[PDB]
Each structure stands twice: as structure tokens, then as C-alpha cells.
């Protein structure tokens, strides 16, 4: 996990187009017609982790190995969803514990463009200021979504600094990043916020919520994976 | 009809791209809009039929 066969090249509003297939765990969650409504991350061949607010159902599909959603010829994997595991602690009011697991009916075929992201340990500490990356097909301007996968490097923010803006809206299962010239936007939800852990890309956050106008000077809020990973491991072990 | 039927569509702070319907009193029809996934207001429906049955004529 966490090691792309195709290395990404770095240097979402104000992000940049990603190297095709360089974020192999990034999936597109689409309805039965092919309409992209959220992103997600493969954690292994049979499971995808995304946001609870995305409201995924077994009627939706997981699209892996995609880069250009405007390309009909591009080879991808349209995977059916067997069951949806929404964290029962998801708070629809505060948006806390915003995570859901998707169990595929048929396993994804890992390859150069399709593989898993690593999961952190509940005790992992990703220091504020750490430069991480988020990816997705969300709006690049606050408008239709970009066809090609976008990426952006952004710093993790301390809870104290995040709260300077969002105040008490920041809960224990949330982690902030951004306010640095880039911003996740509509369509990016459920997607990954990854940071390197001993050289391997690890899922630190899941795009959740933020500026209602996708302002690049405001902290973006993500589901804090370290606070939810035990729930993840438990769900996998039981299913 | 409920006054919430007269409110403009509300995307919310979440970052999903979910298609929902809202009643547009200016046109007298329910139209689609992008919902972010959380904190939906009441003029937000999963189908045009639900929207018309709740807000039609407002």
C-alpha cells in the first residue's frame, strides 16, 4: 500500500492536473448513470473508504483506475457495491465521524493504476505543518467538474489554528488542512488527504466540509482517520 | 404551501456533488441543484415528484 507504480509529480481550487494513474487508490463514486458525486480511496481489493455524508448506496458504483472522466475509451473498472457500512456514530448535525466503508461485490483487480492507500495507526501523530496531498474531480472554480483528476499539496493545521476560524465546529474526529492557496470543493468529498509515513502514502483525512465558497484562505476540514481507523479495522475484521 | 418552498436552494458546507430537487416559485417547477451532502434545508428533495407534491403551486 501507499506506493504508486506511477510516481506522482507535485508542484480542487488552485490545484493541478495529476500524472495519469499516480494516485491508484483514488476512485470515483458514481450513480447508475455514471454521474460522479463523491471520491473515495481503495484500502484493499475489496474495500473503499469514503465520507458518510456522501450517502452511498448499493445502487451506486465504484470506478477505479480512472483519470479522464471525459474519455470514453479510457480503460477503467466499474465495480458494484455489495454493502455499505456507514459509521453509526456519524453525526448528521455536527458532521463528526464522517466516514463510511464500501464492500465491493467483486474485488478490484490491482495494477499499475489501481492499488491501495495505507491506513495509519490510531496513535500516529502527523504534525501540523506537514505537507500532505489531496486529490479529486471536484470543482476547480466555485460550473462543471474538471474531466481530469486534480491534486494539491497543502499543510496540516493545528486544531488551535483551525479553531481560530471555525471555532467550536471542529470536533474530535476532524482534522484541518489548507488555508494555503488551495481548497477542496464540491465533488471532492470522500476523497483522500494523504501524507507520507516512512515513505508510504497514508490516509490521514477524508474530504468532508469547509468554506461554502471553496475559499483558498480558509481551513478545509477532513474526517480524522486516526480517530476512526479502529472502527475501520473492526468493520473489516467482522465482514 | 410551506414557506420553506420559497427559499433558494442550499448546497451546504459539505463537499459532495449530489443531485437534488428544489421548488422554484419563479418558474412554478422543481429544478435540480447540487447538494453538498449535509445540513439540507427543507426545499431539498430526492425526486421531482416529492418536490412537486410538497411545494407545487407555492
Swiss-Prot record, chain A:
InterPro entries per record: Peptidase_S1_PA, Peptidase_S1_PA_chymotrypsin, Peptidase_S1A, Trypsin_dom, TRYPSIN_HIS, TRYPSIN_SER
Main location: secreted
GO biological process terms held by the UniProt record: digestion; proteolysis
Record field: catalytic activity: Preferential cleavage: Tyr-|-Xaa, Trp-|-Xaa, Phe-|-Xaa, Leu-|-Xaa
Cited PANTHER family: CHYMOTRYPSIN-LIKE PROTEASE CTRL-1 (PTHR24250:SF66), CHYMOTRYPSIN-RELATED (PTHR24250)
UniProt-listed Gene3D superfamilies: Trypsin-like serine proteases
Subcellular location: Secreted, Extracellular space
Domain called Peptidase S1: residue spans: 12-237
Record keywords, A-Z: Digestion, Disulfide bond, Hydrolase, Protease, Secreted, Serine protease, Zymogen
Family the entry assigns: Belongs to the peptidase S1 family.
Disulfide bonds: 1-118, 38-54, 132-195, 162-176, 185-214
PROSITE patterns: TRYPSIN_DOM, TRYPSIN_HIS, TRYPSIN_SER
Originating species: Bos taurus
EC number(s) recorded for this UniProt protein: 3.4.21.1
Annotated protein name in UniProt: Chymotrypsinogen A
GO cellular component: extracellular region; serine protease inhibitor complex
GO molecular function list: serine-type endopeptidase activity; serpin family protein binding
Top EC category: hydrolase
UniProtKB/Swiss-Prot annotation, chain B:
Domain BPTI/Kunitz inhibitor, first and last residues per copy: 5-55
Cysteine pairs bridged by disulfides in the record: 5-55, 14-38, 30-51
GO CC terms: extracellular space; serine protease inhibitor complex
Keywords: Disulfide bond, Pharmaceutical, Protease inhibitor, Secreted, Serine protease inhibitor, Signal
Primary localization: secreted
Source species, domain of life: Eukaryota
Record-marked site positions (Reactive bond for trypsin): 15-16
A Gene Ontology molecular function term of the record: potassium channel inhibitor activity
Subcellular location(s) of the protein: Secreted
A Gene Ontology biological process term: negative regulation of platelet aggregation
Role summary: Inhibits trypsin, kallikrein, chymotrypsin, and plasmin.
Descriptive protein name: Pancreatic trypsin inhibitor
Organism: Bos taurus
Organism lineage string: Eukaryota, Metazoa, Chordata, Craniata, Vertebrata
Amino acid at each position: 500500500c501507499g506506493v504508486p507504480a506511477i510516481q506522482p509529480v507535485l508542484s480542487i481550487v488552485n490545484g493541478e492536473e495529476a500524472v495519469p494513474g499516480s494516485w491508484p487508490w483514488q476512485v470515483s463514486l458514481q450513480d447508475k448513470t455514471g454521474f460522479h458525486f463523491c471520491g473515495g480511496s481503495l484500502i484493499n481489493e475489496n474495500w473503499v473508504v469514503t465520507a458518510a455524508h456522501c450517502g452511498v448506496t448499493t445502487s451506486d458504483v465504484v470506478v477505479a483506475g480512472e483519470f479522464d472522466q471525459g474519455s470514453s475509451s479510457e480503460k477503467i473498472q466499474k465495480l458494484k457495491i455489495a454493502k455499505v457500512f456507514k459509521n453509526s456514530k456519524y453525526n448528521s448535525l455536527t458532521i463528526n465521524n464522517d466516514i463510511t466503508l464500501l464492500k465491493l461485490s467483486t474485488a478490484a483487480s490491482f495494477s499499475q493504476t489501481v492499488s491501495a492507500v495505507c491506513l495509519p495507526s490510531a496513535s500516529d501523530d502527523f504534525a501540523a505543518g506537514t505537507t500532505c496531498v489531496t486529490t479529486g474531480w471536484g470543482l476547480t472554480r466555485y460550473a462543471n467538474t474538471p474531466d481530469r483528476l486534480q491534486q494539491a499539496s497543502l499543510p496540516l493545521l493545528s486544531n488551535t489554528n483551525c479553531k481560530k476560524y471555525w471555532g467550536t465546529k471542529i470536533k474530535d474526529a476532524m482534522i484541518c488542512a489548507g488555508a494555503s492557496g488551495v481548497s477542496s470543493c464540491m465533488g471532492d468529498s470522500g476523497g483522500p488527504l494523504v501524507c507520507k509515513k516512512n515513505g508510504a502514502w497514508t490516509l490521514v483525512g477524508i474530504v468532508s466540509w469547509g468554506s461554502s465558497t471553496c475559499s483558498t484562505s480558509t481551513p478545509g476540514v477532513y474526517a480524522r482517520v486516526t480517530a476512526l481507523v479502529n472502527w475501520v479495522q473492526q468493520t473489516l475484521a467482522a465482514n | 404551501r410551506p414557506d420553506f418552498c420559497l427559499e433558494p436552494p442550499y448546497t451546504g458546507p459539505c463537499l459532495a456533488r449530489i443531485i437534488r430537487y428544489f421548488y422554484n416559485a419563479k418558474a412554478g417547477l422543481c429544478q435540480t441543484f447540487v447538494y453538498g451532502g449535509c445540513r439540507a434545508k427543507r426545499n431539498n428533495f430526492k425526486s421531482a415528484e416529492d418536490c412537486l407534491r410538497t411545494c407545487g403551486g407555492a
